[PDB]
UniProtKB/Swiss-Prot annotation:
This is Guanyl-specific ribonuclease T1. The keyword Translocase does not apply. The gene is rntA. The chain holds residues 27 to 130 of 130 of the full protein. One of its GO terms (molecular function) is ribonuclease T1 activity. It is an enzyme of class 4 (lyase).
Length: 104
């Protein structure tokens, strides 16, 4: 069973932890990868009800299980905060334009 489902993509907690660890490490070293400069601040324009505190940062989580290193980011993202806490897992899949909806 999936811990998180983003559209058709199935993710386990290990998947999200691995993705978060890579993005958080880049955040600490003050480095970014890709044309869209990940990881970067996530403003929560959508108004999701995150239980943990801000600031939030978004980082791509890939369906292949591979850690994002620069190319096409895909539709899925893990959102983490300054204390290395997972705020949520979101996706552009099933959402209009560049909006996001939460993975279930
Ligand atoms: N939809 C959305 N985009 C955000 C948010 N915070 C930052 N962004 C960025 O604001 C712009 C419009 O969506 C994009 O550059 C997007 O970055 P990403 O495209 O990298 O997600 C947010 O909370 N919601
Ligand atoms: Ca997996
Ligand atoms: Ca692989």
């Amino acid at each position: 069973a999936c811990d998180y489902t983003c559209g058709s993509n199935c993710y386990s907690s290990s998947d999200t932890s691995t993705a978060q660890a890579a993005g958080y490490k880049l955040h600490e070293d003050g480095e970014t990868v890709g044309s869209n400069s990940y990881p970067h601040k996530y403003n929560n324009y959508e108004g999701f009800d995150f239980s943990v505190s801000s600031p939030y940062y978004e980082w791509p989580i890939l369906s292949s299980g591979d850690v994002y290193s620069g190319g096409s980011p895909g539709a899925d993202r893990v959102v983490f905060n300054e204390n290395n806490q997972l705020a949520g897992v979101i996706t552009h899949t099933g959402a209009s334009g560049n909006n996001f909806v939460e993975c279930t």
